[PDB]
Amino acid sequence: MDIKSFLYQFCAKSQIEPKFDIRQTGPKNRQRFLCEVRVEPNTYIGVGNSTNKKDAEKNACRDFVNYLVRVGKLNTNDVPAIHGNWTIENAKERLNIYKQTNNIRDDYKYTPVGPEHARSFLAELSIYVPALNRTVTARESGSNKKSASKSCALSLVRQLFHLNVIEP
Amino acid sequence: MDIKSFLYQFCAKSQIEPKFDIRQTGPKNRQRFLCEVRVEPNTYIGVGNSTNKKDAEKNACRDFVNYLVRVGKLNTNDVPAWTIENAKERLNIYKQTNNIRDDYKYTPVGPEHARSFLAELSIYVPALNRTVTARESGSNKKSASKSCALSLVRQLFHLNVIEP
RNA sequence: GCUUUAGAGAUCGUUUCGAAUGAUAAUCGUUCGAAACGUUCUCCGAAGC
């Protein structure tokens, strides 16, 4: 496992998160990063250095884990190393149900938009409705595939609502 | 360019760095994120918030930058809305004379979560009229490039076209 | 301009953990966090030519 994943997983129990602070300190060409981390209820602050902040974060993390090992809060063995009230929060989950219920094994096709450093997507899906002998389809943009797939599913649920194939 | 990179690229102009402080707010059925941001020496605190961290910091930046324009440090139009180390360096100038505009052709192989890249490049050298080629791989395109570039160069230091 | 090297920020993919919304397995998904391996762009200290 990863040390920083592990500490977040230790706090996740208590609905809190580790609170990191960080400050750079060196010559601007061999610069060094100083990192501290707190977690409530504890007063102790775990510190770590490195030439980059990702690593400084983890050295700090392992030192906070050392402290909870050292004050016996952890054992050494557990440690490693509204169109009918359908919208974006609700449409994708809803269309999923429809998809499962009518064994519509097809899935969203994505196409990339824009450059790699500013990538977005289109999500495309078509559902055939044998009852009405008729296909609804959508191609909607989104900042990522997940986002795109929901606005796609939103377009599809709305059209299917407007055909009394779906409730609200 | 996004609002927070902007704030950083405006701070690099002084070798100073923004400083963020993030905190959660609401309970399990409705939890939110509060982000505060400071740029020394300015006393101003930028404040943003939202359902997720990234958007909470972008809001905190946008607020801070909105401050900097009000106080005259920025202007609204400025804001948005033979080895692998020397192998590459030596090959690019061998390529530089012969106006060879051909570049590395990369090919991603393996699972997306553990890529490897094939790098290929061929040079129709005219000294002999063999056309020399390299096909090497790395776990990222720069590594693949260098190993590719290195194969090439070693295949000419051994055919006496490159002083070692 | 090219190379080597210490960095920073953004972008997206795939993968993987965690937190949250009678039962066994299977399968698709929603919100938040964290990690792995990578792509792309911008910023940038130093060194060589």
Author numbering:
A (entry chain A): 1 to 81, 161 to 247
B (entry chain B): 1 to 81, 165 to 247
Task: Please share text taken word for word from the publication where this structure appeared.
Maleless (MLE) helicase plays an essential role to incorporate the roX lncRNA into the dosage compensation complex (MSL-DCC), and such function is essentially dependent on its dsRNA-binding domains (dsRBDs). Dosage compensation in Drosophila is achieved by a ribonucleoprotein complex MSL-DCC. The ATP-independent interaction with roX2 is mediated by the N-terminal tandem dsRBDs of MLE. MLE also contains auxiliary domains, including two tandem dsRBDs at the N-terminus and a helicase-associated 2 (HA2) domain, an OB-fold domain and a glycine-rich region at its C-terminus.
The linker region connecting the two domains is not visible, which is consistent with the hypothesis that this linker is normally disordered. Similar to all other members of the dsRBD family, MLE dsRBD1 and dsRBD2 share a conserved α1-β1-β2-β3-α2 core motif, in which the α1and α2 helices lie on a face of the three-stranded anti-parallel β sheets. Regions 1 and 2 are inserted in two successive RNA minor grooves and region 3 contacts the intervening RNA major groove. Thus, the NKKxxxK motif in region 3 mediates shape recognition between MLE dsRBDs and R2H1. On the other hand, the residues in regions 1 and 2 of both MLE dsRBD1 and dsRBD2 form sequence-specific hydrogen bonds with the bases in the minor groove of R2H1.
